[PDB]
Amino acid sequence: EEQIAEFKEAFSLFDKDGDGTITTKELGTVMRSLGQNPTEAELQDMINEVDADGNGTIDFPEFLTMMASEEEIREAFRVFDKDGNGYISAAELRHVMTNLGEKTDEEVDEMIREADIDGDGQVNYEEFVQMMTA
């Protein structure tokens, strides 16, 4: 169905300059913001594996075709949990989301409450998986 609405949005998080296509650079930066260090070669292998046209960029229709686990998440958690204490504070949550692509404390504290099962005011690993595995 129109779940193509979630992929379109996912596509837009990558298609940063919104020119309709994802490039090698534009892919590397998002992957870096999430704790990875892909090489330039890996950035063209991945694109070309989705790039059916022969351009070097991925447009939405191509992206959709492609779009149709612990370590990636445990790795994301560590990007969030900047001081590695097992808890994502409200400060760390801001710092990382503004690095992921975002500019308030009502927006951040709403985030915490939306996943704060035990109610301690911060986000642990367990609570983290819940918001990543939908």
Binding site: E6, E9, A10, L13, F14, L27, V30, M31, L34, Q36, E42, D45, M46, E49, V50, M66, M67, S69, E72, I73, A76, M97, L100, G101, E102, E107, M111, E114, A115, M131, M132, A134
Partner: peptide, 23 residues
């Protein structure tokens, strides 16, 4: 809104890219 759907989307897409790379 939902800063979390955004994060989840990015993470999950990056994982799929890693996958197509390995498949």
């Amino acid at each position: 809104a939902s800063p979390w759907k955004s994060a989840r989307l990015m993470v999950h897409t990056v994982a799929t890219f890693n996958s197509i790379k390995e498949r």
